[PDB]
């Protein structure tokens, strides 16, 4: 008996189902670490991260909401992205879109 205990049923949850995804190789060319969040518009991340920005347009990291991927200096790795939904209007970040798409 543990007060307020959970009885979680076993299994897994499939995240962001039915959405377009794509994988890209990213490399941190900066001398300081860079960490990216789950919903940040990937195409507008720190310029020190070298990758195909054109492909990442309208995409974010396909990871559990609230988590992040960290890139130490010189670190190269392949990440999976998932496309934005809703109105697919990008506002903010580095101010490169500021509108639909």
């Amino acid at each position: 008996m543990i007060p307020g205990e959970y009885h979680v049923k076993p299994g897994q949850i499939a995240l962001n189902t039915g959405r377009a995804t794509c994988r890209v190789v990213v490399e941190n060319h900066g001398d300081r670490p860079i960490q990216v969040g789950s919903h940040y518009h990937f195409a507008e991340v720190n310029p020190a991260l070298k990758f195909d920005r054109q492909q990442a347009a309208g995409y974010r990291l396909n990871i559990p909401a609230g988590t992040a991927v960290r890139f130490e200096p010189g670190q190269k790795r392949e990440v999976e992205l998932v496309a934005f939904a809703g109105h697919r209007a990008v506002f903010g970040f580095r101010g490169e879109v500021m509108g639909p798409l």
């Binding site: 543990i2 307020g4 205990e5 959970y6 559990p64 939904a85 809703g86």
Partner: protein
């Protein structure tokens, strides 16, 4: 992408199919539905989702909510679901999926720059409780009740005076006016009851026109057929509720005579079991009638080993009885019966009794309405097993039946359900956030009209709000003008029309009661049973359809010694 259900539960709280134990009881609830889109849950913190352009949009204040409770597990009479809650203008805006429509799907609760966030993942959110049997013996009761999770208090009194010690009555225009003015200082919604014991209707109309939302008939002031009739007549006229504490002495007649005087008119019977007052020994038979809205006070909930022992002296002090006067002690003893006390618990489980209340400092504990309601539920599951209406391997229905007792039902009974009583769109945002381990005992946050009014708070000088000592302290929602904007003072339609608020210069938001005469037993959510109940005049045994209704006294109870320092 995939994630295990356990990791998911740890991150965003439980989802569909997961079960949670309520505090240290044997009651388990199962998430019935989840309104989120897996992968799109909103979370606040460094590097999280709720950030500009991401989980937070570009909309102006008018197009977004003021407050959002993320990943909340709602427990209400209509369901036990996982969802985000949006609050706007101090009221419940929506229950659904929060976020930014610019990049997220299915957003029904828009988050913008004008939105504050309360993280409810792993927490249970319920509506604020409503106690309708308050004796205004002292103002300190308000804070005690608020801390327990009760946000609305209906009752009567003028302070620690003899009349108030025994009855829930605010006698006359002068006292009614003074108490209405004093109400502005308390962090809970308030509605007052006047003294209904009189056979001259004008004496009652004055009180209603002064501001009371109901009239209390108490035997200490004379619960005679003439007084009862007079009060009910005025009630039908002015759309206010009548609360009854019948003639225990059987002086003017027996229970059937009182029922005859009521004549099928809507009435709320206080402490229907009897210990708190009422025709000895069969006032409990009142729950069989369609026009009766029956409630229980909390000392008898639930039936335990020490229950009987503590009652005699409690009774005497409350009603100003003399232990040296034989007739005074005999009448006290006639009110305490193991038989009716045991049956009351079962009647609640069956839905024959629709409300739970305190009877604050007058044979009742103001901070124990919610706590005791859940102890009864626990004891009933332990003794009777699953309810007939229960589906699945959980106690979802029993939970819904019991939560309705101190939320929606009290609101319906007193004509305030249009403002409070449940987590529904348009209602005042009176919400209580609980950690599963402390559910019904000690809340994590108490929100009054959209603002946190009280919550546990650690060292004020600490680097974070969590260091010890952690104890309940009033927040901004309980301060001066902010408080006035986040609380409601209920008035009768007559008082509101006469401009009582402007005359007394009441500063809080005003709400009017309505629908008090049309409510009946059939309207009590999950508690509409009208049993063919009888009480043996000599043995006091309670029977429903000839079957004996009884239960066993608890030796130990959950939500007790594991949580309190004293």
């Amino acid at each position: 992408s995939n994630i295990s259900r356990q990791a998911y539960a740890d991150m965003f709280g439980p989802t569909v199919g997961d079960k949670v134990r309520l505090a240290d009881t044997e009651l388990w609830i199962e998430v019935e539905d989840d309104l989120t889109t897996y992968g799109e849950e909103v979370k606040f913190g460094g590097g999280k989702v709720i950030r500009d352009g991401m989980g937070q949009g570009q909309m102006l204040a008018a197009d977004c909510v003021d407050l959002v409770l993320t990943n909340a597990l709602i427990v209400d009479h209509w369901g036990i679901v996982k969802a985000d809650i949006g609050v706007k203008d101090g009221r419940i805006f929506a229950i659904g999926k929060a976020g930014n429509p610019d990049i997220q799907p299915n957003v029904t609760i828009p988050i913008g720059a004008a939105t504050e966030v309360i993280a409810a993942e792993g927490k249970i959110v319920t509506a604020g409780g409503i106690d309708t049997h308050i004796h205004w013996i002292c103002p300190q009761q308000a804070e005690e009740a608020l801390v327990s999770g009760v946000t609305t208090m209906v009752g009567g009194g003028t302070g620690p005076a003899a009349g108030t010690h025994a009855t829930t009555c605010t006698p006359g225009p002068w006292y009614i006016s003074r108490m209405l003015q004093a109400a502005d200082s308390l962090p809970v919604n308030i509605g007052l009851l006047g003294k209904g014991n009189v056979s001259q209707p004008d004496a009652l109309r004055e009180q209603v026109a002064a501001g009371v939302i109901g009239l209390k008939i108490q035997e200490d002031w004379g619960a005679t057929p003439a007084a009862i009739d007079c009060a009910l007549t005025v009630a039908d006229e002015m759309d206010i509720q009548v609360a009854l504490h019948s003639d225990t002495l059987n002086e003017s007649g027996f229970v059937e005579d009182t029922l005859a005087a009521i004549g099928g008119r809507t009435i709320h019977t206080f402490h229907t079991e009897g210990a708190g007052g009422g025709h000895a020994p069969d006032i409990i038979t009142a729950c069989a009638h369609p026009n009766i809205l029956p409630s229980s006070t909390n000392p008898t909930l639930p039936y335990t080993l020490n229950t009987i022992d503590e009652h005699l002296d409690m009774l005497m002090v409350c009603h100003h009885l003399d232990p040296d006067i034989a007739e005074d002690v005999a009448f006290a003893e006639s009110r305490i019966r193991r038989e009716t006390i045991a049956a009351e618990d079962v009647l609640h489980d069956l839905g024959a009794f629709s409300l739970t209340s305190s009877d604050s400092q007058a044979m009742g504990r103001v901070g124990e309405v919610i706590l005791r309601t859940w102890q009864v539920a626990h004891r009933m599951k332990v003794q009777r097993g699953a309810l007939a209406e229960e589906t699945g391997d959980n106690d979802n229905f029993r939970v819904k039946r019991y939560i309705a007792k101190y939320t929606i039902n009290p609101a319906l009974t007193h004509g305030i359900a249009h403002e409070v009583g449940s987590i529904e769109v348009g209602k005042l945002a009176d919400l209580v956030v609980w950690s599963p381990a402390f559910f019904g005992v000690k809340p994590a946050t108490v929100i009054k009209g959209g603002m946190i009014a009280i919550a546990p708070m650690g060292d004020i000088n600490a680097s974070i709000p969590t260091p010890q000592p952690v104890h309940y302290r009033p927040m901004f929602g309980a301060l001066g003008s902010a408080r006035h904007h986040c609380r409601l003072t209920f008035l009768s339609q007559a008082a509101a029309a006469n401009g009582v608020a402007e005359r007394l210069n009441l500063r809080s938001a005003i709400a009017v009661v309505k629908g008090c005469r049309t409510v009946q037993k059939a309207d009590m959510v999950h508690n509409s049973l009208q049993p063919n109940i009888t009480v043996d005049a000599q043995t006091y045994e309670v029977r429903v359809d000839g079957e004996l209704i009884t239960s066993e006294p608890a030796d130990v109870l959950p939500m007790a010694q594991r949580y309190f320092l004293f």
